[PDB]
């Protein structure tokens, strides 16, 4: 098999790239045509063909996927970490993703982005060609095989992280064994918010403030150091993920954005989990438009009064603080006229939700276990202090939410990694203890080819994510390759879940059978954070840059 | 000339067929070579080569698609009816159909049935190349507009059926309107079963005995006739839906496998709805492999005592009778030793479901909304007269119920095309209502291109049905043909609900809007009547033959 030789695997995998580059190119300068036929991009030239303008992002992230997947795998066989798993992981990736590239990649389960869609061809060349041929029935039974006897190890094949990497990868696996996957069942069937003893293990364990400055009470470490708390605690359940994720975005926005008083005032307990923050930006009628968004504030003396609805807000009836994004200029409709507000709070109760004066809401009935919860809010001569609005200048609200996007698109990424490995590791644990024809069904190829393609799938978007991290701890911009991360992630979640489910049969459809709270968790991750349809949008506006 | 006009599109669509009829014969010649290179099937080479197999399935599958979508829309030009949305349905169907066939289809999410998995290779020939790309945005465009335009019709293009058929879908469609659409959202609300009022409703209705003949208080109608009712049926819930199919099922059982005496005892009751059933099959270790269950039936004096554990029982409380298989020769382990048994019961209340002496059981708690409710059931002395043993003989339970399985596959392929249609319906009004970036979410091609592909499948899989039922409506063999369309019906509805989710974003999740409770009916359909590894198994044993 092509796996008992890595090296070669390795070379072929280089030889291939060019054609791919050029692959990409020509599709961008073929976008650039049907769009810009002038030079301009034509907004409704780019409605129009927005069929082939998400193909070109979602082309261009497989080629982003090969070239980071090959890039792992030689940083392994550069430390001497290039096994078998790694290898056969590689080899059916590299098939896989060449042949989807070839013959259609699904954006949706209906959605395929061909090369026809832009009316390109492609003739493989003799690497390509024969990396195409790589994903077969002896590697995906071989990968599943080693997958079952993959017993001590936190993923299914090296990472490549570093050490420093792993062992933080290997707490917060202890801590989501220990208090998160025990109960998630009871949380779940009592109707009930993470527990408060969990934020306060969380927040001691220095979760909430882990990539806030020293100087403000956090611990400066890295964001891939947060992406791999956030794999380990969504692997045990998404929103203990999603908690950590709300600290860090909160702090990123105020560091960005704020002024030196604002900073001092907000960092330390956002860093201590003293103080609990969510984002409050969707309204009823605006979500992905947000620019748009009707919400006001209007002065008062040196203060601000707000009115407007807003809804899908997450874990608001806990907070002190929410990031709350508000129309200042009246005379405006569109992005420039909003302002950011570190809109505090009173802590509400489940009977008083929302005590403070000017501020109603509900909770939403939402699908699946929703740990924070959802909210509905009405805002009707809410009040906010002059000095929280974040940066001190009205009408910069828009950009310094665009500051976070990187580590949004980034955090997100980790969840859908973290939810797409507890899917693997559940269907694995199901496919070897249930015996049917008097087997285990991971003995079936429609089962082990389940789970091979996981393990693949979710090394893929690993590495992705991987690779925006990198960056953004370089302080390079990877406001792209994170949003490739992201499309990526989600949907491999889901297709994760969906294939875990399949498994269980029956069973996957009983609450008693995590795989069904699984399947709504990864549902969340293609809209929650935005849509994939405006993510595979601003990526291909930035490759027609 | 033009080549996508209706005479041309049928044209190509001939002159395409045969190289496919050819691709479909290499298949399975290829597949024999691999699984039976001596002439007999092997087990194991059939376990090994499971993917190629299923691959010839699903590429079967496809083939036959393409076939019937053909003949349905050339029957509606002989009657002058293929109108434009018609030929569009035709147009764009064709082209994606034959671009899955040689790039790849989903069997799921991340197995694709592709040529090479068995070393076929397909060069399109003109026709079917041209054909190919005939998948286009002007044409998705032009299909979403009419779909936005249907006056008020119950499918997106006309069906071809009689005019019977379509007052009969006119019929059932009002009442799922008044009475089921209205109330399901409650229903859920409160965790109960279907109102009893419902299945009076239905009862009148003569849905119970749609089929069964006229001697036994029955409307001797067709097997159409009851697909097109339970698809309505199923467009309102797949729970209303199903009430018909288990009678439907079980009036087939004892139709072909009882006695006299049985039949005149049991059918008129099953017609008048006096009667509800449930089939008592799957047990806590067994559901794929049902000929190895293990529940006991051992004579006592005339009648029978049954002990064993059932699982995942559909509508267990109200029923009166459960269909009952299971084993009455101990020295057995596989089919043979099975018989069937018309297990009269005492239907029961919400706080004792299980009156009836030797039987207990307990709702299982299940992802979504479960109108009939899943029990786990157990038996200790259960005792079933003599009588009620089917057709008087033991050791005939598996044959005779293999004698329901084309009604069984076209029922649960009608049931999906109902689910496909809910969805689309549900999509398409909230893509019409709902603005975002100032215009409805339906011009935007990510939107609008779900939908139209929705109507594609949903009609490819309509067509599939139809056909199958057209084949038993004339007592022709057609297990091949069901089991295609439920293999394909089940997918279709499931990625039609996925997608419609998509384009209600957020509001997707929750429980108010009717997507989140259809998405969980659509996950169902590739299980609940046995998974589609079974469905892809039994269709690729025969087609070796
Ligand atoms: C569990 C959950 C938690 C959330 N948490 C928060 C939170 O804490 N704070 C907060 O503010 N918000 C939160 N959100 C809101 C989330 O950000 C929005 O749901 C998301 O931005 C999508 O907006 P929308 O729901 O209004 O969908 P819409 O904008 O109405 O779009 C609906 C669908 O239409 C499609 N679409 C829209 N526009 C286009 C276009 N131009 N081109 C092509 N397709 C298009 C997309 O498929 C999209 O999904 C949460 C949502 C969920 C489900
Ligand atoms: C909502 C619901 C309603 C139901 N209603 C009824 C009812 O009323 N009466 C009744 O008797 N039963 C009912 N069933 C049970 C249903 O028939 C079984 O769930 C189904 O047959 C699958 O069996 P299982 O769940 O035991 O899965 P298993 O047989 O344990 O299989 C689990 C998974 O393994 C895979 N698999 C298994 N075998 C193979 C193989 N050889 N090759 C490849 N892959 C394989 C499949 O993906 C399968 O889904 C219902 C189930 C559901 C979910
Ligand atoms: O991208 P480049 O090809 O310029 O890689 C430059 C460096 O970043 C590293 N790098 C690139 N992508 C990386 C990733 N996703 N993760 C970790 N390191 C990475 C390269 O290994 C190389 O390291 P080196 O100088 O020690 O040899
Ligand atoms: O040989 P065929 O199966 O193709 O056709 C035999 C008949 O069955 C009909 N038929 C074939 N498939 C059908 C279907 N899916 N639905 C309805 N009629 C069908 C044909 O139209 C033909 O009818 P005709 O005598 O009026 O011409």
Redesign the interface.
Known sequence: MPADTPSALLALAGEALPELESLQSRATEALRALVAPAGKPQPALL??????A?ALSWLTTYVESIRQLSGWAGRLAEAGNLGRIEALILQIGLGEYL??I???I?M?????A?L?DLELDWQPGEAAAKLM?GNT?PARAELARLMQDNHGRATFGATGLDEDLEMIRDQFRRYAEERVIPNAHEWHLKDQLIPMEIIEELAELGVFGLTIPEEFGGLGLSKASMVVVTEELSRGYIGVGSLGTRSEIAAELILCGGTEAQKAKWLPGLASGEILSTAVF?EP?????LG?LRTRAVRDGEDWVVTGNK??ITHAQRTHVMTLLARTDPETTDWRGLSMFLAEKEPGTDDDPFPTPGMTGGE?????YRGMKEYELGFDGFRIKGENLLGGEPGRGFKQLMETFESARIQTAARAVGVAQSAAEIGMRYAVDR????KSLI?????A??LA??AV?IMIARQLTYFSAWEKDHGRRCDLEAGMAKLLGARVA??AA??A??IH??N?????YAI?RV??DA??L???EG???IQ?QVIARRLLD
Do not use: Y
Not at 443 to 447: A, I, L, S, W
């Open positions: 409605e129009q063909h927005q069929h082939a998400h042949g989807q070839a013959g259609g699904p949706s389960q209906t959605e395929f061909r026809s041929r029935a969707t009628n605006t979500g992905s438009d748009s809804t899908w939403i009935e939402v699908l699946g015996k049917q024809f008097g003995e079936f190829p429609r089962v080819d389940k393609m996981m799938e889901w297709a969906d294939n489910l399949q049969g029956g996957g459809f009983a609450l008693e069904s399947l709504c549902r969340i293609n809209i929650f849509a994939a349809e595979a």
